[PDB]
Structure formats: structure tokens, C-alpha cells
Design a protein around this motif. Structure first.
Motif, PDB file in Angstrom:
ATOM      1  N   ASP A   1      -3.908   1.076  -5.246  1.00 40.68           N
ATOM      2  CA  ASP A   1      -3.605   0.990  -3.808  1.00 40.68           C
ATOM      3  C   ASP A   1      -2.596   2.098  -3.497  1.00 40.68           C
ATOM      4  OD1 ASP A   1      -2.746   0.310  -1.217  1.00 40.68           O
ATOM      5  OD2 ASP A   1      -3.215  -1.727  -1.425  1.00 40.68           O
TER       6      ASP A   1
ATOM      7  N   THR B   1      -0.423   4.153  -0.603  1.00 39.10           N
ATOM      8  CA  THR B   1       0.153   4.261   0.730  1.00 39.10           C
ATOM      9  C   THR B   1       1.045   5.516   0.770  1.00 39.10           C
ATOM     10  OG1 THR B   1       0.057   1.896   0.665  1.00 39.10           O
ATOM     11  CG2 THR B   1       1.193   2.827   2.566  1.00 39.10           C
TER      12      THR B   1
ATOM     13  N   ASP C   1      -2.948   3.896   4.461  1.00 39.12           N
ATOM     14  CA  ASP C   1      -3.096   2.848   3.383  1.00 39.12           C
ATOM     15  C   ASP C   1      -4.558   2.631   2.997  1.00 39.12           C
ATOM     16  OD1 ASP C   1      -2.585   0.495   1.798  1.00 39.12           O
ATOM     17  OD2 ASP C   1      -1.920  -0.683   3.550  1.00 39.12           O
TER      18      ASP C   1
ATOM     19  N   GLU D   1      -9.808  -1.555   0.556  1.00 34.82           N
ATOM     20  CA  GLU D   1      -9.029  -1.444   1.733  1.00 34.82           C
ATOM     21  C   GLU D   1      -9.332  -0.102   2.398  1.00 34.82           C
ATOM     22  OE1 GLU D   1      -4.732  -1.289   1.202  1.00 34.82           O
ATOM     23  OE2 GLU D   1      -4.519  -1.695   3.396  1.00 34.82           O
TER      24      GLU D   1
HETATM   25 CO   LIG Z   1      -2.745  -1.097   0.656  1.00 37.61          CO
END
Ligand SMILES: [Co+2]
Ligand SMILES: CO[C@H]1[C@H]([C@@]2(C)O[C@@H]2CC=C(C)C)[C@](C)(O)CC[C@H]1OC(=O)NC(=O)CCl
Ligand SMILES: [Co+2]
Ligand SMILES: [Co+2]
Ligand SMILES: [K+]
Length: 304
Positions: free
Chosen positions: A140, A142, A151, A278
Motif C-alpha cells: 500500500d 501513499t 493512495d 485500492e
Molecule cells: Co492505502
């Protein structure tokens, strides 16, 4: 602490990686407990920002750079590589793009990205454990650039994985894209969770409840709150100029989560695997712009 699965933390961590002073820093970067005064100041609001033209440009840029950095991480996924090594590369890639790694010192988070292996749902801390053949790992990313955060995350396969891993990761990606495909002005934020749970459940999977998608722009997280499970009570309705994430976390077993003593690592209580994808979305008149979309491929990394 009783660990829920086979995973354990692999310490000590390497000393905190410095970011050169020429990179512009979010307010929390230099706060002793990594608290953000601008988040504190907007904490609790239900109002959803309508992005300006300037804002949209800033979100398009930072989200494009975040994609580039995730793509750096993807290229390193193989048996033997530690999540700490992935984080190192991610940290250098962020700096090379004149961005600050948004997770670093966010409420004292120690690393520059989150690496979530197997039963880790989210917020895993990059550490000395080498990835093992058969593992799934979410990275992940960001990034922070010129006042804006972007993000995204993907789950990856480490070598050959079992059929259960393939099905969980496939279904999770399908959940994300079905939710994305519903996004357009006038849809309730609470509706996305109905769509996600419907697909997850049909495939024998459960949906994490304690973690949600979120607004993102000048703050890393803000309104709206976007649960991924059915019959949630999220507030608000999509309008053109809204920017938010959808980031479903899907599990092989039960939905329940607990946090490691590190205060960050979220794991399935039953120790079974969880996968996540995401994107950051901008609502437009037609539907949405996928700001974190891969540009050189129609498909996520796990499909190659
Ligand atoms: Co994220
Ligand atoms: C809105 O919060 C977010 C949470 C958040 C921003 O708190 C995190 C701080 C981020 C880092 C990278 C350390 C994460 C990691 O994005 C998961 C989704 C959501 O989790 C919950 O909804 N809870
Ligand atoms: Co997010
Ligand atoms: Co926060
Ligand atoms: K995982």
C-alpha cells in the motif's frame, strides 16, 4: 500476545530512513507523536470537499506518482526479498519523484509504506522477514506532493500460490472493480458495500468491517467514510468533484480483525488470509476518473 497465525514480526528494524529537507513535508512529519494539526482541525466533519481545478491537477499528479512507486514495488516481489527491502526501494522512489512517503511518522508509523502478508489485513510494518513462496502480499503506497496525498494498493503473488490464494485475490480485485463501476454522481456512499459484500459472499469470503475507504486530498483521510460491507450506515451522496478511495479487504475466513502489540498490524483473528486492492477515485459527470490507474497495462500485477 497470542499471534493469530504463523506470521511473526522480524525485528529489529533498520533506523528510520531520512527524507531530504528539500522534499516538502506534511505537518505530521515533524510532530513528536506524528499527529496532524490540519487533520485534528477537521476531525469529525461530515462535509465532503468539492475539489477545485487546482486540486484536481494536484491529485492527478500525486496519484500518478504513487502508481509509479507501487509499480517499483511490484517489480521486486519474489521469494527471498524482505518487506523492509521493498520499503527501502519505495522510500528511494518516493524521494526520486520529489514526494514525501505519507506513512512515514504518520502517528509515529515507522516505515514508508505498508506491506501486508497473508493474514495481515492492512498496515503491516515492513520488516526483516523474507517473502516465502506461496505468500500473498499487499503493498500500500501513499505519497505526498505539493499539499496533496495519493493512495493505492495491490495484492501480489510470491511465486506459485495455492488455488485458495488465486481465488481470494481474483475475487478481491473483482469486488473493487464492481464497486468502481457503480461510481457516479447521485450514488450513495453506503451502496458500494452492498456491491462488495454480494460478490465476496458469493465466493465464500468475508468482508473486513473495522477498516474503510476514505476521502483523501489535503488530508490523508477525511470524509467520506466508505465501508465495504452490506447494510452500512455511511453518510452522503457522490457528487462531481468528490475524491475518495475504495479499498476492500476480503478474508478466507471470518471478518474479525485484531491489532498486534506494534499498534498498527491488523490481522484476521482466525489467522486465515486477507487480500486488498485500492484506487483513489475522482467523481466526474460521466462516472469517475481512476487517478491511480496503471497506465501501461489494462490489468493489475497479479494477472501477468
Ligand atoms: Co492505502
Ligand atoms: C481512514 O483510515 C484508513 C487507514 C488510515 C489512513 O489510518 C491510516 C494511516 C495510514 C498509514 C499508511 C499508516 C488506512 C491504512 O488507509 C486503511 C483504510 C482506513 O482504515 C480505517 O478506516 N480505519
Ligand atoms: Co486508503
Ligand atoms: Co488518522
Ligand atoms: K494480506
Amino acid at each position: 500476545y497470542r499471534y493469530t497465525g504463523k506470521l511473526r514480526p522480524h525485528y529489529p528494524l533498520m533506523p528510520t530512513r531520512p527524507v531530504p529537507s528539500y522534499i516538502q513535508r506534511p505537518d505530521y512529519a515533524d510532530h513528536p507523536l506524528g499527529m496532524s494539526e490540519s487533520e485534528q482541525a477537521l476531525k469529525g466533519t461530515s462535509q465532503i470537499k468539492l475539489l477545485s481545478s487546482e486540486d484536481i491537477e494536484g491529485m492527478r499528479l500525486v496519484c500518478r506518482l504513487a502508481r509509479e512507486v507501487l509499480d517499483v514495488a511490484a517489480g521486486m516481489i519474489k521469494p527471498g526479498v524482505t518487506t523492509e527491502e521493498i520499503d527501502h526501494a519505495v522510500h528511494l522512489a518516493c524521494i526520486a519523484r520529489n514526494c514525501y512517503p505519507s506513512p512515514l511518522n504518520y502517528y509515529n508509523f515507522p516505515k514508508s509504506c505498508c506491506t501486508s502478508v497473508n493474514e495481515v489485513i492492512c498496515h503491516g510494518i515492513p520488516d526483516r522477514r523474507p517473502l516465502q513462496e506461496g505468500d500473498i502480499v499487499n503493498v500500500d503506497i501513499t505519497l505526498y506532493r505539493n499539499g496533496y496525498h495519493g493512495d493505492l494498493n495491490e495484492t501480489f503473488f510470491v511465486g506459485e500460490v495455492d488455488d485458495g490464494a488465486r481465488k481470494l485475490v481474483q475475487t478481491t480485485y473483482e469486488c473493487l472493480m464492481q464497486a468502481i463501476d457503480a461510481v457516479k454522481p447521485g450514488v450513495r456512499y453506503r451502496e458500494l458495500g452492498n456491491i462488495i459484500q454480494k460478490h465476496a459472499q458469493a465466493n465464500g469470503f468475508s468482508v473486513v468491517r473495522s477498516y474503510c475507504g476514505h476521502g483523501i486530498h489535503k488530508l490523508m483521510h477525511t470524509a467520506p467514510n466508505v465501508p465495504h460491507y452490506a447494510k452500512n450506515k455511511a453518510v452522503g451522496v457522490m457528487k462531481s468533484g468528490h475524491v475518495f478511495t475504495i479499498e476492500p479487504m476480503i478474508c478466507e475466513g471470518g471478518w474479525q480483525d485484531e491489532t498486534w502489540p506494534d499498534g498498527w498490524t491488523a490481522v484476521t483473528r482466525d489467522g486465515k488470509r486477507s487480500a486488498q486492492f485500492e484506487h483513489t477515485l475522482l467523481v466526474t459527470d460521466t462516472g469517475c476518473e481512476i487517478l491511480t490507474r496503471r497506465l501501461d497495462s489494462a490489468r493489475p500485477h497479479f494477472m501477468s
